Symmetry: D3
Subunit: 290 residues, 6 copies
């Protein structure tokens, strides 16, 4: 980097308005996609969480791991049942999901982050009853139907969670939690991140995705938008690809719940978190209420 | 229980001297064997940890899970290498060990305990860098030899651990931890419990075992002992069966490290923890220094 | 006690639901009758208060001492005046009552409890203005009439009292307190216990009595009841013996004031507190609202 | 008081150097003699303790009551045994001493002080094990001899005592305390005050006495001294009247123990505490080390 | 001072009711006039602030310095513009006012007070944004007119100010503060003291003045009053000399804002603060609501 | 700034190692020269202090103002006396120095910083006795000689200073302080910064200067050095220009006193603080011990 020093200066100085806005605040980050599978992006993500924490910002990580679960099920020769396009989560599939999410995928992020200090701590809803789940149905070609032990976040121990954060820790959340009877369900990571963000009074929700941002008329490149209100985007929802739906519903639930902004950012960009939070050069889509 | 009320009274009153001795103290409990596999014993163990916690005693659980790892390795068709009688812990075997211990075995104890309240919290050494490991060799028919990513506890974040306890939580520890280079090792649960007990200034170390207690001349039933000093027991060590060695070495390292007493108790007895801690009717073997 | 160990276990395990319910809670105990005069019961009562305290339960003791006052007055040759069946409390009788309750009866309980640790602390309403009294009249064969410096609890320094408890102390209260002009009155111990329980948000009020429990049609043994609501018991009040009235009015005032349950238990049973709180084998009468 | 306002000003301004020296400090005051029996002096003493407390000074009161005990013993017709000039303290005499000191004499000071606010709190060594006693012998015409349950202060719960003070309370101490076996002894109030002052790191010990101050050659009025070192006064001790000995030994033990100054002041002067602490016009005798 | 000791006592004892009333309370003191220019009065004022602080009272000093500013402007040869009888505060005059008030007049009081301890701390509204100003107009022979950078107190950081006080500091305030755009204005010290007193929930506002007290029909000496309600005094306002107006408007705004009493006291009396606060012999005028 | 986003990212990511090193640490910054006179540099300096503070770093500003004092003295027509090349600091010159430093120069930095939040607070050694001074002599062509009220920092209230910082404030220090007799001296800002840094356990001392960095053989441009140990630089001292001496002696005293590094950086560079702290592209000279 033979770039002149007087320009390295202005780039750092231009972070100041967002350092002020985020100082002392909770930022919830959904981590998934290629930012989770490529080692250079992986290590940049962990470094950015250490960054936030060494600015006195309070990052909270919620992670997915859909593909890793199905690979483990294939390795174990566990045959799936499928209603619509959904695998049914039997007690057996849940045990596998839990052990992959919490005992594999969560662990690598904890150790990556912890390469910068004693920051990361892995948690599920079962730990200290931090949050509960309610069983969810899906609608397949009409009819709402049961697909097993799959839920939404029900209640969140907001107080206990913020203590963890105020102590300097970076929670890395694996989305599993007990229902009211103690039966552990798997929760979609995108919706769980929205619920955590709302419960914790987060200042921002970040959703790492494998796309540049929200297109309204995909694939027209002219259709990429950089900011949008919830009213307009809720109207656009039925239009989007199957992959963008959960990310967009998360931002709707979050920002309607009072989180000031939710962002869909490009997880294939190194240090996308830094770019989105501390420069005005972000590719992402910012969702505000209206 | 049609037992006269005036005798239910004296049994409760006779717990008082041990309630006083244990109030506000750390008690580390190694959990394994049949107390971990049978549901009635399982649920009694979880209830006893909730008991300790609702007396203002500070229990810390360290758990094993040797047999569950090997079953999972067999299910995954992962072929083992064996030096002496020891499986070699490749990077692959560690990933499996970690995901079974932390994402399976630890989870069921957390949910069992948590049936009584928001007490249990699952942790490894990687979480908040709570403890580190140093790689260990074994000696096979002489020569010390490498069996992969297997270690002993190196350093323990004593302060951070006691904060967790003082907040009312029951840590459930899965024995994995990074070395000084961030490479995660698996640690024998018995030795890890001894190290945790010493680091935390525990008042007692409890070691749940599938035997009545320490026999000196097994199988003479006359040989069962109820208390012994470290000097005498260290001399007896080379005599014992292969299974009793790790449990006895744990008690030696703990009590020599200053834990006032380590106990080998019968994990096949329902509520053995309550029996050992709050009555004088215990079957176990108490180890003190001398 | 050659009783099998596996039954000592279940008796201790069956205390757990009440340990959970009482952990961190205030329990007010009225102490009087034979539980106060017999040394074995005395020492069992003190041990049970140390028990509660070493479970992290917050016991508060309120004590009487009617017979001891009159013996001291006889020793001092102080002639009483009597309206109805009530001694008139002159300034002289109050001085004697105060010095017997606080400087004699309170002291022996403090030293008994303190045999188990630095727990007990003796207090009156005059200490730190912990509570005040309002002068009470009685009705004798009709007419309400003055019987001197005898009162009811007026206001309670709830905050200052809970600080004392949260510091690990067991207050032993002698029921004397100043009126609004600084004139110290003697308060009936049963009613004072009800008022303290309500003011402190106690979880239970215990009333030690020299009877098995509440009989509705004394002396029919078939008439003994184990639970009753305030509506039913208030209707029964005018029926009861002169001795049971103050104990029952205390439970009415307490449970109507929001204390979840008040209990009349048999003070002639060793460790009656333990029996009533930690087993379902109690002889007492539980009063709930309705 | 038609005294010019500009002189009322200078009298208040001249208190400032002693307000600074005493701010935040413990001052132990032995209260006895006529300052305890005359109502105008009584009420002035209580007002001065409220004064100290409303300056953020930490007064601690230790009280005697020798004559009141013997009057109560005479009223109760309890015949004394006497070795030398000392009554023997039987178990019976102790019970009476305790109930008079703690339940009579201590109570009136608590209520007097408390006329100014919720300040005073009565305590003995038995309360929260605040201090213990060791049995003391006396020497009668030579031989050291037993005179029953009479002791010296042994150990003081310094930490627990300062918490009481830091919370804004004024402890009023009745000098009774258990020995190591739980047997309560009566302690001479003068020596107890010296021990409390030393244990608490008091800035001053005040000893209220029925004399102008220390005379060296009583009754020469020329012999009255205003300051003296411990070396000189220890040499003078064997010379003094029987009454002055305990007050002087208290000041020796205190100032040698590190209390910066002990004072013998005239308890027959209204507001003697204010005079001694906040003016240079005191009649008392100040004892410093040397 | 050969004044009898028994009268020095009563003068100190008679301070007690006001020590109780003021213990732990904020007292705001406007300091100006001759109490600020004469060294003996200066040093008495500083000593009295140290007095309050060593009683656990919380004094807050607000100071003026009108004449010192104009002398400095004359020394600097800065020619004034005058509308009505008011100098126009140009940017230049403000710089001079700020540097005289904060860097000269405030400094001497800080060092005087600090001769008694580390108490005084100098502050303006610009420090930690402790308070802001809104630009004020005056009315000259009718028309409201601009006289430059002169304002009233707008908002006060009440919380941050009380932290400063609770830490044992004596704030010495120089009345300058930024408007909402960061432009620093000079504020009349009398009105600023009233605003600070109201914002901080002061118990008393003291206004040091170069007069005996409020006269209603000056110069009739019969017309001097010692207490008055706000309703009566507001009606009297239009009657008073030009000098008394700001002092009286301050007391009106303060006491109407809920400060229990504001006092106009004679700053030419040594230790006037002590006289006014701790005796009933004050010359001042007390203003209460009504 | 049309600079590619992926490079704005790496510049921010490369700050992380210094964010970690400085998180929670004190950094003392000497502010003077052109960074204080040019508005763009001025505002960049204030922004960088707000930056540090919004990273949870603890900046402390010490400022000079030599030229502003002499301009004010000329405006006031105050004739100087000069020994060697030093103005004599009479009582009159000190009053002027204090009022310029604290009431002019300190104020503009406080308001600049405070444009970003309630951070800055102006202090001198007289405030809360934060630090004292000892009178210093200089040596003029040999003889050490008195030049009036000019001193070095003597003692620093380390505890009180760190409280101020831990509360989120940015102290802006004007270098004046009382000697042991309360006589306020002016202290050279460079040496004062070194003393403050050592007393506070600062992690870095920054010295803003009007040069690129330390030249060893000025004006050889080949002679500019980027790092140097104290042993080597102490040997070089007698070689340097008159202007560089105080900056270099400050770094010697600081780093020898245990501050890990002192830096001489170019105050004519915008955001030099950011450049020096968060990039490896700094022009400055770093001084470490050796
Ligand atoms: O409150 C908590 C819930 C779950 N895990 C936790 C882990 C830690 C620790 F820092 F110990 F890893 C502390 C606190 C936790
Ligand atoms: O707050 C209190 C009121 C009455 N007595 C008290 C006794 C103690 C002590 F523990 F010192 F005995 C503490 C606190 C008290
Ligand atoms: O909160 C504050 C505002 C302005 N000045 C302050 C000065 C001090 C100190 F005590 F350091 F002088 C502390 C705290 C302050």
């Amino acid at each position: 980097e033979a770039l002149p020093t007087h320009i390295k200066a202005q780039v750092l100085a231009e972070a100041l308005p967002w350092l002020k806005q985020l100082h002392g605040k909770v930022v919830v980050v959904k981590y998934g996609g290629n930012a989770m599978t490529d080692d250079t992006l992986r290590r940049a993500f962990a470094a950015d969480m250490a960054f936030l924490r060494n600015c006195g910002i309070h990052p909270v990580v919620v992670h997915g791991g859909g593909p890793q679960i199905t690979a483990m099920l294939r390795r174990l020769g566990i045959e799936g049942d499928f209603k619509g396009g959904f695998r049914v989560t039997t007690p057996e599939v849940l045990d596998v999901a839990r052990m992959v999410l919490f005992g594999q995928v969560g662990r690598e992020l904890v150790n990556l982050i912890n390469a910068h200090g004693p920051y990361a701590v892995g948690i599920t809803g079962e730990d200290a009853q931090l949050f509960t789940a309610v069983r969810r149905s899906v609608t397949v070609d009409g009819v709402a139907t049961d697909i097993g032990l799959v839920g939404d976040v029900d209640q969140v121990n907001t107080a206990a969670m913020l203590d963890l954060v105020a102590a300097g820790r970076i929670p890395v959340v694996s989305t599993l939690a007990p229902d009211a009877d103690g039966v552990v369900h798997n929760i979609n990571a995108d919706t769980a991140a929205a619920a955590v963000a709302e419960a914790l009074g987060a200042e921002k929700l970040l959703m790492l995705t494998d796309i540049d941002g929200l297109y309204t008329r995909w694939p027209d490149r002219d259709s990429l938008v950089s900011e949008i209100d919830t009213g307009t985007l809720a109207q656009l929802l039925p239009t989007l690809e199957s992959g963008m739906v959960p990310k967009v519903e998360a931002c709707l639930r979050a920002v309607i719940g009072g989180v000031p902004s939710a962002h869909i950012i490009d997880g294939r960009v190194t240090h996308c978190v830094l770019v989105e939070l501390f420069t005005d050069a972000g590719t992402g889509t910012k969702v505000v209420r209206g």
